[PDB]
Amino acid sequence: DYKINQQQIVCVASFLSKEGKTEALIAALASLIPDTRREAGCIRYELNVSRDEPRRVTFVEKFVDIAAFDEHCAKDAIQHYFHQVMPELVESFHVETYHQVIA
Amino acid sequence: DYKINQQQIVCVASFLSKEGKTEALIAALASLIPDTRREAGCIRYELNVSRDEPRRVTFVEKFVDIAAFDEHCAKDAIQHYFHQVMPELVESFHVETYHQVIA
Amino acid sequence: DYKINQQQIVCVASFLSKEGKTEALIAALASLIPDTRREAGCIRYELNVSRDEPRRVTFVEKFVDIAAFDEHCAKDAIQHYFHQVMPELVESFHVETYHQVIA
Amino acid sequence: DYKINQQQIVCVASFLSKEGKTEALIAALASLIPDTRREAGCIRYELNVSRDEPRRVTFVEKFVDIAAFDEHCAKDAIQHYFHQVMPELVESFHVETYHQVIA
């Protein structure tokens, strides 16, 4: 009835901005998009703003495999975001990776 | 630099299974897919199993607009899942809707 | 076994460049992408270069409905491309619209 | 301004049915979908019926790379379709592969 795709990697990464930092956070995350979409192993890299918690900004991502996901995570702009940008703008966050279930 | 799409609706719905209920939960959620994909206003309806918390199963969804999302949520099989299936299989869950940010 | 989605609109539009005009054609078509992706009713707008006929450049598109497709086609940049750019760069072309079959 | 993704493979495959064979053709092509979507390297495999030429049925496809595309093309059901089904149902067809242009 269903089969788990054991190769492709899905990631959902949500970020809760600090008070007054939501526009800055959306801008910081959106700045990552053009180069990420140009990665050979990037399938999907979509940014989203919550209708329920307007401080929440979330990436919905897909990569051809875990090597491509790891390559993405080691990119300079991504590491700069985690190390330098995030501590100034974000209260809390959550990152989860997945395999897709095909039915 | 970016524009929020104010029409299309993104939804991320994550479900944490009870101990021993993960396979039953994946099956219950996967059973919803064929009819949902056949909804005129469904763009995306993808099921995913967590690599980090293997009891977690998550839908990543997109609909043409909020009317189409509301129509989906009122479907008999969806309401049956929430009302009848979920209480037996799920410890906790989270549903969040979003607008997509285009950069 | 399958259901045709009678609402959403798929379009495939292929363009065969004149000799020596392929890079100019890719550039002209790519210039349309950022504003099209920002259309409320645009789902997909992907540009592709043929591996089999390297003068061929093709858009693969999806819109929430025919009104959104018609809105896209009436945009100034799209009409400028058809009227002004295409006659200089393109030998021949084909545009086809579709409904998606869900199985 | 743009970058060609040299890894992922896009395919558009259109089939023009013989008179009276369109429903049979849609069914034959749709029968390929469930197993193809379950391929580890399949990203997209979408079937479409033409609004302009109702005998035309077209697949819009994407695979993680050329090895995954070649694997797909060598599958028993795909070869059975080409060799056994297509000659009975199809007047003419066209298959084109592409690399995606990211802008």
Domain extent listing, chain C:
1-103
Experimentally, how was this structure solved?
X-ray
Give me B38's structure tokens. Answer: 């056949």
Identify whether the C-beta of residue D50 lies closer than 8 Å to the C-beta of residue C12: no
Q: What is the distance between the terminal CA atoms of chain A, rounded to a whole angstrom?
A: 6
Instruction: Of A100, B59, D49, B28, give the one whose Cα is nearest residue C103.
Output: D49
Q: Please name every residue paired with B57 in a beta bridge, in sequence order, or none if there are none.
A: B15, B49
Instruction: Select D1-103's CATH number: 1.10.3720.10, 3.30.70.100, 3.40.50.1100, 3.20.20.70.
Output: 3.30.70.100
Q: Which residues pair with A12 in a beta bridge?
A: A60, A96
Are C51 and D98 in contact, with CB atoms under 8 Å apart? yes
Cα angle for residues B34, B38, B40 (degrees, 5° grid): 155
Give the amino acid at D25: L
Tokens 């029409």 — which residue? B7
Q: How far apart are CA D29 and CA D58, in angstroms?
A: 9
Taking the C-alpha atoms of residue A63 and residue D3, their distance in angstroms, rounded to an integer, is 17
Measure CB to CB from residue D2 to each of C4, C26, C103 and give the nearest one.
C26
Residue C69 has what DSSP assignment? Answer: H
Search chain C and give the residue with CA nearest B9.
C40
Cα separation, C41 vs C72, whole angstroms: 9
- Answer for the pair B72, B39: CB distance below 8 angstroms, yes or no: yes
Structure tokens at A21: 């930092």
What residues form DSSP beta bridges with A49?
A57, B99
List helix spans (H) across chain C: 22-30, 33-37, 66-73, 76-80, 86-89
Q: Nearest by CB to D102, from A6, A38, A41: name it.
A: A38
Q: Which two tokens stand for residue B13?
A: 């719905």
**Phi first, then psi: what are they for C77, rounded to 5°?**
-65, -35
Three-state DSSP at C14 gives strand
Q: Which chain D residue's Cα is nearest to A3?
A: D38
Among A48, A34, A42, which Cα is nearest to A77's?
A34
Q: Tell me the C-alpha distance between D88 and D81, whole Å.
A: 10
Q: Which two tokens stand for residue D92?
A: 């003419």
Tell me whether B83 touches chain C (CB under 8 Å). no
List phi, psi (to 5°) of A71: -60, -45
